[PDB]
Design a protein around this ligand. Structure first.
Ligand SMILES: CCN(CC)C1CCN(Cc2cc(C#CCNC(=O)OC(C)(C)C)cc(I)c2O)CC1
Ligand SMILES: [Zn+2]
Length: 196
């Protein structure tokens, strides 16, 4: 089955936010509002902001999952390729098969769904640091979009869900992801193609 990608703010007014990192050739992570698409280098830090209009209950959690964007691939589980799943680059917490990791959160949990077999990573929802207006999660993407035997050049979507302590839906947002060597150039290219 295919998880929903329907944007849903819910009772707490949940939505994502992204930094404005620009498109210099050196940039390692950059987000295109026009394309709703994050472009990032392999295994580099991707800051994703969580915004709400009101405080969700204690025990609320935030889950990330990847799916293929194209209709003809949506039913296939997104996973790391046969090379990267074996490169012994685990942080001690993430299963080496998982495309999406959360960086620097000891409370991150990794799920292999017993029915859909899809992978996800989930952390507790927490208020912002004192002085900040939103909470930031740092994600890593552990294969290139081009990885043979894995994503193999197929575009993916990351779906971020706000959940209660039982796993019930409270909110949902999503964005496309390309993991590539030069995110700055690729974002410039794709934005120009869109303008045409
Ligand atoms: C209009 C928006 N604005 C106006 C001033 C508020 C700014 C202050 N925020 C607080 C806030 C809490 C959370 C949380 C949580 C889990 N419950 C949890 O930790 O519960 C407590 C704190 C009760 C223990 C996540 C986020 I992202 C977040 O912004 C809410 C919005
Ligand atoms: Zn790979």
């Amino acid at each position: 089955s295919v998880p929903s990608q329907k944007t849903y703010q819910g009772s707490y007014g949940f939505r994502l936010g992204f930094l404005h990192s620009g498109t210099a050739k050196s940039v390692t992570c950059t987000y295109s509002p026009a394309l709703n698409k994050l472009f990032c280098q392999l295994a580099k830090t991707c800051p994703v902001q969580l915004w709400v209009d009101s405080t969700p209950p204690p025990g609320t959690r935030v889950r990330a999952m990847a799916i293929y964007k194209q209709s003809q691939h949506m039913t296939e589980v997104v996973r790391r390729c046969p090379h990267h799943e074996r490169c012994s680059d685990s942080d001690g917490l993430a299963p080496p098969q998982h495309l999406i990791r959360v960086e620097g959160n000891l409370r991150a949990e990794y799920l292999d769904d017993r029915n859909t077999f899809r992978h996800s990573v989930v952390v507790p929802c927490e208020p912002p640091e004192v002085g900040s207006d939103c909470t930031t999660i740092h994600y890593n993407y552990m294969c290139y979009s081009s990885c043979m035997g894995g994503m193999n050049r197929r575009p993916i979507l990351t779906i971020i869900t706000l959940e209660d302590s039982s796993g019930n839906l409270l909110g949902r947002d999503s964005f496309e992801v390309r993991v590539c060597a030069c995110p700055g150039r690729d974002r410039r290219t794709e934005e120009e193609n869109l303008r045409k």
